[PDB]
Design a protein around this nucleic acid. Structure first.
Ligand code: MG
Ligand code: MG
Ligand code: MG
Ligand code: MG
Ligand code: MG
Ligand code: ZN
Lengths: 56, 193, 50, 102
RNA sequence: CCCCGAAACCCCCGGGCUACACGCGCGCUACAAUGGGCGGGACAAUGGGAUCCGACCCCGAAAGGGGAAGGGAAUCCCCUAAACCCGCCCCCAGUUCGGAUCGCGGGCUGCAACUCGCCCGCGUGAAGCUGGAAUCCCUAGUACCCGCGUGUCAUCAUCGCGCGG
RNA sequence: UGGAUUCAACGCCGGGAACCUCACCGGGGGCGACGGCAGGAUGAAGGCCAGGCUGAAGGUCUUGCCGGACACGCCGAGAGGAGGUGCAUGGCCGCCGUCAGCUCGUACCGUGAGGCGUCCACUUAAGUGUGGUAACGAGCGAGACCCGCGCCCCCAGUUGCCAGU
């Protein structure tokens, strides 16, 4: 078994694969408006804990 | 670094800390934390209900914990200390977790819920509501609300005054959701004395 | 595992190496032979007999 | 005499007011000339998520909001004043920044 | 819970999700004069900005290119909006309406632009001349009309959320 | 590739997919923690020089290569699974519906299930109120509450404004 390991975690720099939620790890609907990186779901779950309020 | 960036960063970091500790100190009635970046270092304070459990065996736990803190999360010099909840029976996430812990021990849900309600309303809450939702009483799931006292649901006074807590009880056959809501002895608008 | 690689030949009171050597590398580096060139075991890089 | 700008920002008007009152009362404890807490436009970070995971059903949105209140205070730069405004408590949910105009 | 479990796990290349005889939903552009073009004249707000906004200068027909002040945000920039008005051509017609399609060339992003991106210039010049049955939205700064911002975003907005006129 | 099919699917899954995203297709390569089993490091678990295959690959390989070091070649037992099950669940969402409903304590009525209140008439956006009434009171919900806009006053005057001098 003389070989070479080939998982190759490729470092994307732009793309839906480049960005990943820091909580769940989802790749698409990620919030990045003011330095966030969060899936819309997670954000809706935790926004109060961050201080976001729902007065409208 | 803009200022809103700073606020966002602090909130997100603290939220992830809170998540981790919620996972790891659920036996301890982990109510929450607070964090201050003093010059000599960042000192944090864990509000929980069993500091005995969070310290473990002569500071073992806080030690590996602070290691995790400075490593996995950007922190200058962690200075963990510990404190209690002044009235945990008025806190509601600690109670939700205690109830989930009970249901996992195997206590029947009506008994556990009514025990917790009795405890809270003797420890002095104006109102309490408890929803248990899931595979209770067989394979088809249902929801049961146990309530006592006086509890508001809607409005800013609800969003502010009542304390909400949620927990999962991971049992053999699946999850039981535990929602708890506690209204302490404090007043609303239409009182008008 | 090739699993047996005694290459030195004992001349008697001293060994003589079956190996060749690479000039642009350091000491101890031992080489192979592929019909016109050498091979570095330490790192591996271009080389030929010439 | 060269001046000192103090830009301070928070999410709590009351902590903000506490700090400004600290500064007012300390300047008048001394006699250095304050320039008022000029209130700057407050930042409304708005995030309009859809509140549904399923993608099914009517589309409904959560408009979450974070508010950052901002004040600036100009006070003449003295070593005394500077030492003590450094000594200020500056609670946890507040940022400050002491620039100096010279 | 069941299953895969060295494959139904992980990674890479390429393709596909972008195929099209057709039916449907929501919309954009129009079928012109209650207008089209050309040249001139005016008037916003909301929001956003670090490898990010980029004034200002120069180059270029354009798209765009080089350098670059200031700006971590009531300081700088995005940002002198369009509908509107004035003058001149067109004078009721498949037209100076309409811009499907296609050819040639020139560019930007990106590791990569064929499949399969966006932009510019010359050229082409498709149906369509107001729409049955039936149906939708709306009660005041509302509807209609006009454009703008932002989210998505390496580049891509006939979209979403919002802004004003 | 899938999900969703009247209202409440069909510019929805923030779904504007060149790679990623991806779950589809063609091909290529890695993965057994813990134990034990075949063994064992003897110089290798693992990486690896030039090439042939290969789309391209120390992936593999005749030919050779050593920096100093254990075991899928075999079992269980797994890690991970955007694999199935949303009629196994939680959480969230939509719809009924920002509708005006849902109930309680005591009393009374009824053998009882239950009823009354919670009905009637006006009124209101509203079980909102007025009055009548075996009902009297109360609670959740509605309202109160919170956010913003619009007029005035006070404070404050920078990075904002510029009338007056
Ligand atoms: Mg034309
Ligand atoms: Mg005509
Ligand atoms: Mg869209
Ligand atoms: Mg009723
Ligand atoms: Mg209300
Ligand atoms: Zn997430």
């Amino acid at each position: 078994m003389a070989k070479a390991d080939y998982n190759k975690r490729k470092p994307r720099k732009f793309g839906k694969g480049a960005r990943r939620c820091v909580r769940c790890g989802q790749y698409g609907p990620v919030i990045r408006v003011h330095g966030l990186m969060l899936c819309r779901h997670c954000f809706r779950e935790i926004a109060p804990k961050l201080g976001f309020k729902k007065y409208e | 670094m803009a200022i809103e960036r700073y606020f966002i960063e602090e909130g997100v970091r603290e939220m992830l800390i809170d998540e981790y500790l919620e996972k790891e100190l659920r036996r301890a009635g982990y109510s929450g934390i607070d964090i201050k970046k003093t010059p000599l270092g960042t000192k944090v304070v864990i509000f929980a209900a069993s500091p005995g459990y969070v310290i473990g065996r002569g500071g073992r736990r806080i030690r590996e914990l602070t290691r995790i803190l400075e490593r996995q999360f950007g922190l200058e010099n962690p200075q963990i200390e510990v404190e209690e909840i002044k009235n945990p029976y008025l806190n509601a996430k600690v109670q939700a977790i205690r109830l989930a812990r009970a249901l996992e021990r195997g206590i029947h849900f009506r008994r556990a819920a009514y025990s917790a309600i009795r405890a809270i309303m003797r420890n002095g809450a104006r109102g309490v509501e408890i929803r248990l939702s899931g595979k209770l009483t067989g394979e088809r799931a249902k929801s049961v609300r146990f309530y006592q006292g006086y509890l508001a649901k809607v409005g800013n006074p609800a969003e502010t005054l009542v304390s909400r807590g949620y927990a999962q009880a991971k049992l053999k056959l699946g999850v039981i959701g535990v929602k708890v809501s506690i209204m302490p002895p404090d007043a609303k608008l239409p009182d008008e004395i | 595992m090739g699993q047996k690689w005694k290459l030195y030949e004992v001349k008697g009171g001293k060994v003589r190496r079956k190996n060749k050597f690479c000039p642009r590398c350091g000491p101890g580096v031992f080489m192979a032979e592929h019909k016109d060139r050498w091979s570095c075991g330490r790192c591996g890089y271009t080389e030929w007999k010439r | 005499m060269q001046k000192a700008r103090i830009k301070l920002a928070s999410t709590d008007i009351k902590a903000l007011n506490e700090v400004t009152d600290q500064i007012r009362q300390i300047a008048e404890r001394t006699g250095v000339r304050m320039s008022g807490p000029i209130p700057l436009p407050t930042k409304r970070i708005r995030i309009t998520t859809r509140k549904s995971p399923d993608g099914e059903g009517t589309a409904t949105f959560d408009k979450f909001e974070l508010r950052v209140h901002k004040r600036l205070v100009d006070i003449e730069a003295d070593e005394r004043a500077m030492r003590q405004i450094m000594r200020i408590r500056v609670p946890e949910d507040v940022t400050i920044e002491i620039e100096l105009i010279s």
